[PDB]
RNA sequence: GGGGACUCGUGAGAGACUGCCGGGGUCAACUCGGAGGAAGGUGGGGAUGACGUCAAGUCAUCAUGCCCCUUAUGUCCAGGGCUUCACACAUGCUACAAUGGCCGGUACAAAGGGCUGCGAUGCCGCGAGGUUAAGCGAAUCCUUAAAAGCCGGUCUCAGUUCGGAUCGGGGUCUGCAACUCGACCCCGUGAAGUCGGAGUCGCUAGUAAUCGCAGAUCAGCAACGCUGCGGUGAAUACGUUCC
């Protein structure tokens, strides 16, 4: 059917929507259905340091941590391309699921 | 344990001390430390050595003070008086 | 500022009573953000307003505040080793800021029940001459008409 | 911190309630975070040195 | 209008009216309006002395009030006291005894400021 | 082909879908007097038609979304006056001169570290 | 089911430069006023601290030179303390009420958290909670009912239906354990306080004032703190003499 769905997710941009461009390029050349890279909202978790190791509390830093959601695709799950969906390297950076 | 689900708590290393003088019926004092324990209806008439910080204070369970804690008997800290 | 006069906010027109004078009085009775209970009482005290005369409330408001507007106030100035207040003359929106700000302020320690009937009162009894507000007016009037002689040094 | 205080806090300690946290990288037993590890002080120099993705300055 | 000895303060509504007598605050007046029937917009000068039998002796059945409420009052505090506890000592003081803050303030169980 | 517009005030976002009728507001599915209860804010709504004198016609209804009820005030008066281009190309030099096409952007300013507020600081107390 | 219109999510870009007009200025820098534009002269706010000062702070984050301890100034554990209380200061909270209290009804957010978890629904309890268990590593499910606001009713200016300290009793949950010393709930109790002396603080706009919500640390929590988020939303600025 249309049962595949994959999950990236990453730290950074720009590293997550070129693997999701061109490296999910090896999909419809093995003639199968997508739908395209959808955005996801992105996560925030912010920190908030002191900046002195002593009695300065009123000077202070703002970390955040961002990442990244997109690539929702529900492409069709063909035996001959659910080989070749898992054999390109990912990048380091990017994570992903197949649910 | 402060809750009525799960009893009142009293700990183990007591219990065993008075009922091996409750099996014999003697008086002899209980130096302890667990300032944390309920006193329970079979410590009537038993005194104890309940330490403070500093060193053991003696105390008579009489028949009031049954639903009280046993540290709350000796004293931590001091003060007499600013002047 | 150091760098010159900054710009003043217009108000617009009041939809229940097409004035900009009833619009200025809700931003004075106005405290802590409660502007829909700000415009509740003096909606509320001008239709008593009208309850107790017939005539047209903001009519009634015009007539409560040329008896409040003072013409002249007595602002303070040190020269040497004394003081002396100088008689300067009231700019005209100034005036109607002075005047709004006394009938808010002596209404709200007034001897009624309601803030309704408090703010009421105190625009019935200026309209004929007759309130704290009006006495305000006079006094502002009679200690900057006892330092005639002080009115030549205008800054 | 005490080296000995280290080695406690890593291992398992009677009645579980009684374990804490320390941070990975200097054994500080306040400020730490728990999605890092760390102190305050150590996630400061570890995310300006970009040692830990993810993580850098936020303005808004 | 005396309801157990406490003369209730004329011209009143019946839902704060209860509430004069020690020992019955809103929650107890909102269930002896409840149980007797007597609704709560009512001011006690409007009262039926046969609607006050109704709820002069709901209360002794149920209830504690003046006199043995303030002396079984009493006697919890006279109880610590002897028996040495920890409040016992913090009673006799005039200290507060719920564990409280006794640096900065604690005001209510001492006086005003003795400014040594 | 319908009229598509949205305005925005402070975190308010309205969906304007004016279409010509007998002039009727049903915000939300609820009318005007039935979600906005108050006088002040239903002036400002329909203050864009009293300027173009089209306030019998165009009846509407909005996706109110987002904000408080006086952004959703605000955010539906340019809605309106965004709308109104769309069927006149007339009227744009009477809305923007009364200043009914300004977004007017004046947000919640951030709460800053040290301070108590966006701008307030706490007690000085020189010593 | 489906639609690609509208929002939104988030990628890539367009846009503001004194670019255009008029007056002033050495024709210059630039300034005053327009037009057009979502925005006009740094559009709003953040990030960003030159050379140095204060022998400023930190040897208790870490690191380190000297110096001292090595049957103890090392290290383990149980109890206690860090929470004391004639007082003095400092920063806040809740108040002294009618622009309010209480009861009933009803409307509109934003940014966040969730696997040793978030607990919908049902059921029992006045209530904190207990129990059962769906769905959810989440734009999906839960957190999640925002509170002020609006409308109706009542109180009627009183130390009160204002205030909610203190104390008495009864509980729930976390945890080996809640006495010293946890928070929350129920019933009772109902203190000072009626707007604060000399003095002193913050704030120029979505600011001040007021109203909630969330996060970190965290078993629980002394959270009224801190860092954020949105709601409603003012009054003024002549001016540069004085501080
Ligand atoms: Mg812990
Ligand atoms: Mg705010
Ligand atoms: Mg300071
Ligand atoms: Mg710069
Ligand atoms: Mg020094
Ligand atoms: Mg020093
Ligand atoms: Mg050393
Ligand atoms: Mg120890
Ligand atoms: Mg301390
Ligand atoms: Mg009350
Ligand atoms: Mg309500
Ligand atoms: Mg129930
Ligand atoms: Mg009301
Ligand atoms: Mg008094
Ligand atoms: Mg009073
Ligand atoms: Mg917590
Ligand atoms: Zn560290």
Redesign the interface.
Known sequence: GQKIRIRLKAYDHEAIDASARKIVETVVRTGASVVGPVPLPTEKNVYCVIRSPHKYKDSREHFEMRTHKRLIDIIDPTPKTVDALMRIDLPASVDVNIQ | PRSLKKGPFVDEHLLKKVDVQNEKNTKQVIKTWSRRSTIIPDFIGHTFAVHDGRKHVPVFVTESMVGHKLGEFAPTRTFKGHI | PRKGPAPKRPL?????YGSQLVTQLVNKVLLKGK??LA?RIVYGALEQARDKTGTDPVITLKRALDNVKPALEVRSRRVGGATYQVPVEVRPDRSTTLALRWLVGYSRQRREKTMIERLANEILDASNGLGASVKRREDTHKMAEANRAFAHYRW | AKKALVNKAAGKPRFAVRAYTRCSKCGRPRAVYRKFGLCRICLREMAHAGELPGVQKSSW | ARLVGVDLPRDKRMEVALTYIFGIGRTRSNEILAATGIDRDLRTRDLTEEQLIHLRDYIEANLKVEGDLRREVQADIRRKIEIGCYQGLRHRRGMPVRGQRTKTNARTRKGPKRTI | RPIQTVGRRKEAVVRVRLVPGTGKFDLNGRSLEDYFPNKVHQQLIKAPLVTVDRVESFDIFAHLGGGGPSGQAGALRLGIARALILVSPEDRPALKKAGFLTRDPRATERKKYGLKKARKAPQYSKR
Do not use: A, G, M, Q
Not at chain 3, 12 to 16: G, L
């Open positions: 617009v027109n009041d939809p229940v502007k829909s415009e």
